[PDB]
């Protein structure tokens, strides 16, 4: 039920930053995030935990949603020529330096 407790907690806060419903593709952010790769997929359990991360950071932990970063792509040498290992989530500062370099899985 904790898979549903995540959205039970995340749909009772006034400051709407992320939305989780476990229904057909109900995942969006405030756009104050620097979102670059298109969400609204809900592919796997990754998205729910990532949204709970966003809720835990923007609220409670007191980080500005403008500072954060989601699904950042970087071009490295790479095991595969197309994957371009992508930062799952990140918390920068006012100078642009990544403070929290967070990778979130299922």
């Amino acid at each position: 039920n904790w898979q549903r407790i995540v959205e039970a907690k995340l749909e009772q806060q006034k400051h709407k930053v992320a939305e989780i419903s476990l229904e057909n593709g109900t995942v969006n952010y405030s756009k104050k995030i620097k979102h670059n790769r298109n969400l609204k997929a809900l592919t796997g359990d990754e998205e729910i935990v990532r949204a709970f991360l966003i809720d835990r950071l923007v609220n409670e932990l007191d980080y500005k949603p403008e500072y954060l970063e989601t699904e950042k792509e970087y071009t490295i040498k790479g095991g595969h020529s197309k994957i371009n290992p992508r930062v799952d989530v990140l918390v920068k500062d006012d100078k642009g330096n990544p403070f929290f370099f967070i990778e979130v899985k299922a």
Binding site: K14, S30, K31
Partner: protein, 54 residues
Amino acid sequence: ESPQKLFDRINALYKRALREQLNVTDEQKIAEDNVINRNKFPLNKLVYTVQALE
């Protein structure tokens, strides 16, 4: 019809206006925001304005 009904059904219009006209995203900012202060602008003036501009 009671001026309060006019106030409510115009504030509904204005709140719906701050989603496509002024495209305000924060749903909490959509609330706590009204057409008139109800104290600086008496409701009778709003009724007269509606009558003139309807």
